[PDB]
Each structure stands twice: as C-alpha cells, then as structure tokens.
C-alpha cells in the first residue's frame, strides 16, 4: 500500500460532507499517478437515494479538488439497523 497527499486531502473534504457517517475511509491505489482512489462511506443522510445518487454525493465531495473520479471506486450505505 502507499498515500498521495490527495489522499489526506480527499479525506478532509469528505469528513464535512459527511459528518452523519458510521463509517469513513479513503486509499491511494495509484503509487505512480494518484489517478484512481478507493472510497468507504456509510451515513443516515443516503436513506432518500439510489446507489448512483450516493455515489453521486461522494462525487462532489472532491470533484472541486480532484476531478477524475473515472479512477475511483465508491462503496456507500446507510445505516438503518
């Protein structure tokens, strides 16, 4: 495994977009670009959304940082147990 510094970064912005997660976590999978990123999300707010509208979400989260979500992979939830 390794980090980019836009790995810290992407995690930053996603802590305030989703204050309400259960769970959180990012990983560089890309040690020679820093193109493609894992994602790990679960929050009470996604309960009024699809898949492709939680991912959604996330999306924006770093797109105003980072834009090439074509590289990451997003894994999101609600918690509703």
């Given at each position: 495994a390794?980090?980019?510094?836009?790995?810290?970064?992407?995690?930053?912005?996603?802590?305030?977009?989703?204050?309400?997660?259960?769970?959180?976590?990012?990983?560089?999978i890309?040690?020679?670009?820093?193109?493609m990123?894992?994602?790990?999300?679960?929050?009470?707010?996604?309960?009024?959304?699809?898949?492709?509208?939680?991912?959604?979400?996330?999306?924006?989260?770093?797109?105003?940082?980072?834009?090439?979500?074509?590289g990451?992979?997003?894994?999101?939830?609600?918690?509703?147990?």
């Amino acid at each position: 495994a390794t980090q980019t510094e836009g790995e810290l970064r992407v995690t930053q912005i996603l802590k305030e977009k989703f204050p309400r997660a259960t769970a959180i976590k990012v990983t560089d999978i890309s040690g020679g670009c820093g193109a493609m990123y894992e994602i790990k999300i679960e929050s009470e707010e996604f309960k009024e959304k699809r898949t492709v509208q939680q991912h959604q979400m996330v999306n924006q989260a770093l797109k105003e940082e980072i834009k090439e979500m074509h590289g990451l992979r997003i894994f999101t939830s609600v918690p509703k147990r």
